[PDB]
Symmetry: D2
Subunit: 30 residues, 4 copies
């Protein structure tokens, strides 16, 4: 499904939203 | 890394936080 | 001072992001 | 009725959740 990443989603993935954990924001990548 | 799921993380996974996309919350599972 | 609201921010307010609580997303309004 | 803050909610307020904007997390204080 969607995988959390920083700083950005990678080739093939579309950024759908945001994840929050360990005190920070991440890209939610689908 | 961390994978977003509903309604909960599954066996082997630790819930680290939350994902936000398509208008809803998901479990962030690591 | 950002204030959490649904379904949207009101006149005079700028939507800056999102809040999460009580199981749902809200507009963060600044 | 919920207001976003860092680093914590203050006296009289209870932390209900989290806000996301300008690249960081905030406490959602109700």
């Amino acid at each position: 499904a969607c995988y959390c990443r920083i700083p950005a989603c990678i080739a093939g993935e579309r950024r759908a939203g945001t994840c929050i954990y360990q005190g920070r924001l991440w890209a939610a990548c689908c």
